[PDB]
Design a protein around this ligand. Sequence first.
Ligand SMILES: Nc1ncnc2c1ncn2[C@@H]1O[C@H](COP(=O)(O)OP(=O)(O)OP(=O)(O)O)[C@@H](O)[C@H]1O
Ligand SMILES: Nc1ncnc2c1ncn2[C@@H]1O[C@H](COP(=O)(O)OP(=O)(O)OP(=O)(O)O)[C@@H](O)[C@H]1O
Ligand SMILES: [Mg+2]
Ligand SMILES: [Mg+2]
Ligand SMILES: [Mg+2]
Ligand SMILES: [Mg+2]
Ligand SMILES: [Mg+2]
Ligand SMILES: [Mg+2]
Ligand SMILES: [Mg+2]
Ligand SMILES: [Mg+2]
Lengths: 898, 898
Amino acid sequence: MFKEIFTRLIRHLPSRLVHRDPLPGAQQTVNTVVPPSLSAHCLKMAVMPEEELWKTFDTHPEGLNQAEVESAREQHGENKLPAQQPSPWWVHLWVCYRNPFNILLTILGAISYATEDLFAAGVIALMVAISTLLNFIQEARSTKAADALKAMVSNTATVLRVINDKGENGWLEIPIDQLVPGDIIKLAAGDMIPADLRILQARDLFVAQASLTGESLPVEKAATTRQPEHSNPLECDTLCFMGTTVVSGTAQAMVIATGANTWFGQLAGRVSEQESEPNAFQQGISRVSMLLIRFMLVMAPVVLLINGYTKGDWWEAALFALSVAVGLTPEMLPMIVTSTLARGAVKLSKQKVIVKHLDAIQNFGAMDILCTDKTGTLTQDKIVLENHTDISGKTSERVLHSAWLNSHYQTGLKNLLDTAVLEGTDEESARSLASRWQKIDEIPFDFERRRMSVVVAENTEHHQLVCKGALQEILNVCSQVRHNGEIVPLDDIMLRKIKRVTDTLNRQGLRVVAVATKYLPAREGDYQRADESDLILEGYIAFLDPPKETTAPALKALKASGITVKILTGDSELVAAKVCHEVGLDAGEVVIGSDIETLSDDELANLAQRTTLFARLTPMHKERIVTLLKREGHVVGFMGDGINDAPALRAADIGISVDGAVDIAREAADIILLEKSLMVLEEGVIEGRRTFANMLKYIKMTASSNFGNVFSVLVASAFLPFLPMLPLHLLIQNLLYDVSQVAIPFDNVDDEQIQKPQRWNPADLGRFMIFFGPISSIFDILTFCLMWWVFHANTPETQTLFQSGWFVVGLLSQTLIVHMIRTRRVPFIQSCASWPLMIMTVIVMIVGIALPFSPLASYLQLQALPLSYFPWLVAILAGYMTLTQLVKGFYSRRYGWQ
Amino acid sequence: MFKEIFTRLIRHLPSRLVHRDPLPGAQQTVNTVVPPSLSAHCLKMAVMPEEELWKTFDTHPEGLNQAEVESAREQHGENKLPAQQPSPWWVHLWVCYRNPFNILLTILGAISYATEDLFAAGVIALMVAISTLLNFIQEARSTKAADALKAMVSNTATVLRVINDKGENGWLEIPIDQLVPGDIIKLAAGDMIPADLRILQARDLFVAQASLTGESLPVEKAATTRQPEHSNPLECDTLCFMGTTVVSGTAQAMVIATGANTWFGQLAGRVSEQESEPNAFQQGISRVSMLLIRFMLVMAPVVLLINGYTKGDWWEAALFALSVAVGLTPEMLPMIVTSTLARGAVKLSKQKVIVKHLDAIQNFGAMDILCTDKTGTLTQDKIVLENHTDISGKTSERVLHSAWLNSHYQTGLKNLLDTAVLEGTDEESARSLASRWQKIDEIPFDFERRRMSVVVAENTEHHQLVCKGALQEILNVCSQVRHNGEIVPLDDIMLRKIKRVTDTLNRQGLRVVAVATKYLPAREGDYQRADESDLILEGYIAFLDPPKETTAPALKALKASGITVKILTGDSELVAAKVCHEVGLDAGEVVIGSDIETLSDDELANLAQRTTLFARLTPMHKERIVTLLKREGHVVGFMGDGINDAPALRAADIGISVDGAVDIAREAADIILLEKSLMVLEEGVIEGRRTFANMLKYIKMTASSNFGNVFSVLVASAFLPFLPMLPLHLLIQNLLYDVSQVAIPFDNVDDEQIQKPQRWNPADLGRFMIFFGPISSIFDILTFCLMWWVFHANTPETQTLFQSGWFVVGLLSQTLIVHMIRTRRVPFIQSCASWPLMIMTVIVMIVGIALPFSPLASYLQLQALPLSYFPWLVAILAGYMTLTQLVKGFYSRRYGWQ
Ligand SMILES: Nc1ncnc2c1ncn2[C@@H]1O[C@H](COP(=O)(O)OP(=O)(O)OP(=O)(O)O)[C@@H](O)[C@H]1O
Ligand SMILES: Nc1ncnc2c1ncn2[C@@H]1O[C@H](COP(=O)(O)OP(=O)(O)OP(=O)(O)O)[C@@H](O)[C@H]1O
Ligand SMILES: [Mg+2]
Ligand SMILES: [Mg+2]
Ligand SMILES: [Mg+2]
Ligand SMILES: [Mg+2]
Ligand SMILES: [Mg+2]
Ligand SMILES: [Mg+2]
Ligand SMILES: [Mg+2]
Ligand SMILES: [Mg+2]
């Protein structure tokens, strides 16, 4: 325990490949007051006139040429966090070369084989150099390939710039990282704010400043200040901050700060600390490395003492001990992780399952609860039927026109209703209505009201207040009904008639949306929420969106694989239960969102496991239920692409999203699907499990044989009067084994280890490496005895034959046990291996067997081999390969292979 | 030269692999003289009592043991046409060995090389044997693989038999070719009759005998005859014949005749005559062979005369002539065709595009018009909404039960409406209705009436006549309307109201189905079509089946590839036009099927090219329009799976069907999709186009080089005083080239030759072989000159050096030209080749190079080679390989590569 050196002998993968990005835009709204310097700077930056910003920076409303932009970027920096910047390649090569084991091995080789055998020191240096070069090349290629997927789904911003020749403007799109202070961008509806901005012109813009303050309701933004005093940096009504979204309207602005110099960085303390959080993966890797280093430190010094006490060459004994123990170095773990996860990431990218950071694969194949939504996931989102009826039940042709205006003079996100309404009316009426009315104002949508209104006028006499929304949210405010072509007061029986007729319209999959209007005199101020009072109800619009064809087979496959699907919707409870019944899902009993509001954590944690359907949920309920569903040991995934599902994605253990959605919903995600569906997800889960199934095998088959070799050396070398194998032979054996192992990430996995949500136990290695280690030791000692007695050996004068024989038999045994302990079934007749692995094994086997009979054998302190040794070698190899097949039965009976 | 009959040097592929099965069940009802013996036997069969058929055969109503069935099958035969039986493998080996070219070559080798060297004759025999053995193995393996896909979609039949051999009945399903005479089978609705039957018990069975008589109406089938006199073999009312389906009811019969001893065999004359029909493929395969044989007889005798006049060994000259000319043999075509089509068929089988006979691939990648049907191809075929309303527009709750009774007492094919109605009622009401009523009779469905009726009684006092069908086909009969709870007479305005309300229900995608009942007193006879008079209308049912999600991308992909899609529906003309608009397909103007009935052939031919939609079509219109769309030369495909689209699938140039359909629809089809969709078809069309490209390449890149070698020999053998290459070397060259070419049907085809509905022209082989042939003769004569002058040769005592050099350079030039005349782009940087082809090329190259420097070289009359010809070999090879790249430009600009 403790041993601060043990934390320095373990290298770490970069924090961009294994850790979730710490900056979603908001993260945690800490109570850090921060020095008043930044607040004063922001307040100063929010008061200068338009002309001052012209000269403070080099901004020009015609674009920035390709020369000034580079100079300004180099002067200031880049729009990236400090932790997201890759390291230089030469530093990467250097850090992979100063490993303590490698440096000690080189120093000890220089000490021992110098005064008489300088060539041995040279070849030792060559071997360590080639090993570290192989590791560096593999890791560098994998980490370069893994960063191409991160930039393929990056957010974009619309800058003006210059594109073609000169002053051509262009309004081209660039990634948010290629941003420079003093640059002008344009904001539209549903768009993340890249960095701190300064609005120049406005068109009734609204932003959701809830990620920083918690006001929930959107806050209006304008170019020239309208409030008398700001007194705060977050309410200046003139700037913008990253992490927020644009809810309504369009505007233009110019950036004033980028990188870590903005808000949410040093102001929120995101860079300061907040990094001492290992996310499971970083704990398992550390535990595995600690186990390996503990076993190495246990094994090495006993062998050192034995070889230093039997003979008198202490330096040689220490070097031999280090050479034997080098096979269990923790330095191999980064290669094992990166070179295997990168290939899985590329294969997933081939199936439109783009993965942002490599760690997501571990949680993507180990989950057992999927929390999705209704629209898009189950339904087509394209409606094929709609009836713009009236209050009595007749086609009106007035409700449709009163709903066209509300869906043509609004700048919010378009729905599945607005497109249908725009495509429903004929061209002539649309043109006439467009020519007859002019937009005046707009009240944007916000939750807890569920209602959107727009104010339109025809002439300079009066104004209209057309309105839509859910049926209950207009029926709760309206006061009159236009019945039989005349305005009549709304009494109580008419309220009990609509709630029956429209409830009958439900239970069939039809959604109901009401429409209300109001005549209002000529005003000059700005409207607000409270203006929507005492309107006249006109009618409703009932429409149907059918279920997607590829829904039932996806659910059957997900149930077969062990994943349980739960629906967290925010629609009505009568609908979303018929939809769940048309696709075969067992809705059972539903739970509304009002009951959850008065339940304790213990009650909810046990209620939420037998529901399968929650209706009428606010986002807070979603975020609470997602958190509570992870109670016992489960892994919970949330799939959603709305504008308000920012905390839910981070709260769950995975953040599955969809490409082509709101920017904030993609900035907080982990896996970005390229096509919203459920069959793609199902086919990607299988590959996610399969890729991670190779890593465990690649670790186990490498650790077990090395431990067996170390144990054999410890047991046998005591009686032997000389070193069984010279260290150079061990080094070249390890190098050849590492070369042969490269083809493992391209293996075949049986269809029995993946049809279950798999859980990773790092302590299984310490048992699998003890049960499968001495099996090689028995045959190694048998080969020692056979070469000693049959072939007239154990002569201090002549010993190269013994070392050559053990080298050959050891390489054969090490390389040929891979094909037998990779499966639970009988090999080569039920579960074979992939062709590249066989090809690499054969090539390495030929190279190893042909090395002693080569001109270079004498240079490497090795000699030839008699032709009578081959049958005994084959017999020993076949016996060792056969024995493990019979032994394998007892291991799984104890705790389980996987 | 003609002499088509004299040309018996053309072996033919079996008729079961390239020709459509001549027995679709009815074929053509030609007026052939009926054999009196067969008619007498048929009339005699259907008069015996129940007990006589017990002893006429060995049938027992408990099954047939696994011994009696085998003996009876061996005594009578098998339920298969004589043309669909495989040949013994030893006969296959023999027919591949008696090839006239091979026999003449062997005889001439025996004549020439026997009095001075028997070893030469021995090795000649060995070479020809190994060649014919390779061809036999390839063809046999491919034709064995190809017949596994033909029995995977074979029609089944429910026989009783014994499963445990101790007595358990079983009712197991077997293919219709394992049927033994004297066996009992059970018939259900929608089941083609396997063979001639004998009905034992009946449950109001109906069979559509419209494939042998043309009545077009179902004919009732009984168990004990009720008609007084038969007087005809096709109206006995007790027997069944193959080719006819079961429309309604269930029954149990016993087979009497199987195989070619049935009706439709010697009666319809299917086996006798009507065999001389080449289906395009059999014409191109003949013309290509004719061209090859014409060139061979043009080239051989001139070379024979030259080598017999220059030298004096006439036998050697003739043997050399045949050895040079053996490359252009027509015997290699069957291997080229089968071994390349079988792999494509297997790959299609891997994508659920199962192909019945191998010729369908040629017409599956060359079609430019696709004719399909609305339901199932565009809609999901399951309804998500339905309204069992009343005449005035209210939920009647009475029209539903009057529909449940009809949908619960029918025996015909189930529809999308019946499943919903059976699922659209609560369990209690269903149980009450089932326990209250009883079934009496049933009038089946038939076209030209478009309705179904069932007679149901509750107490023995009266009955009911609940009827279903189209709105116009029921409103044309009914006389009263149950309105406001009282039966009111129907008048004219009530007819102009329904046809407006229900036409407003259309234009939205809703289908309308009416319901009518009638109160009828107690009867004892059988009802007919005319009893449906003066019914009381109750209401209609409007439902909606939504479009399938994967429809628009499929249509976009099909339009990209050039496959124009046309709709031939049999539904209303108001619906099926909104459905086409929802999926994005253009409709324009709609053509009703009544207008087509009064149009000539030319007007219909020039009209059906710009319609894209046909509404309200009877099957005769479907067949006529399908026939008349092949006017210009286009290829027309029909997709359909109904009970009446039997002649349409055969009239079209390709019978695309769907697995799981009616048996008659599958028995008259070429491709059986395993999943109804428009994306599986699209992904299979590309593979179909791609396999034919590989076939064309494999044909083209073989004959041109051989013609080049023949021309080179003809040019250069005059002045040369001895044979440039001994015949054994040429034979081994051809053998090694064939071994290298084995891997061609695994190649990569560029995505430029398959983006158009390609079509085949056999005359292009007589041009590509003349343009690219002599391009190898210049380098061949240059190599001759270089070896003669630079290497001090053409001494009539030492000549093996010349033969060795030319053999090596010729093998190199033949094998290395493949990789550049296989694409139009620049090779190895824009379009590479598949790895197996490269591996085979490398292996063959190594074997060819190492052969002269081998101990066996002296046995084959071939010596070593000095280490100075290698640079000249490499230089000339590179020059020849790089000249054709520049030459390739002028070829495509003349008539086109493909
Ligand atoms: N632009 C909008 N933003 C938010 N809510 C909207 C908007 N337009 C309509 N609504 C209504 O507000 C409620 C919020 O539904 P929302 O789209 O957030 O649901 P969800 O959680 O994504 O799931 P699903 O829509 O599949 O049931 C619904 O009643 C919806 O009809
Ligand atoms: N069992 C039935 N057999 C045949 N036609 C039926 C049957 N039941 C109802 N019909 C009606 O008879 C007509 C024949 O339609 P059919 O199923 O043959 O069309 P189709 O050519 O396959 O094309 P579509 O996709 O429009 O259905 C339709 O009006 C259909 O509603
Ligand atoms: Mg406003
Ligand atoms: Mg949503
Ligand atoms: Mg965006
Ligand atoms: Mg070992
Ligand atoms: Mg009847
Ligand atoms: Mg049909
Ligand atoms: Mg069948
Ligand atoms: Mg040649």
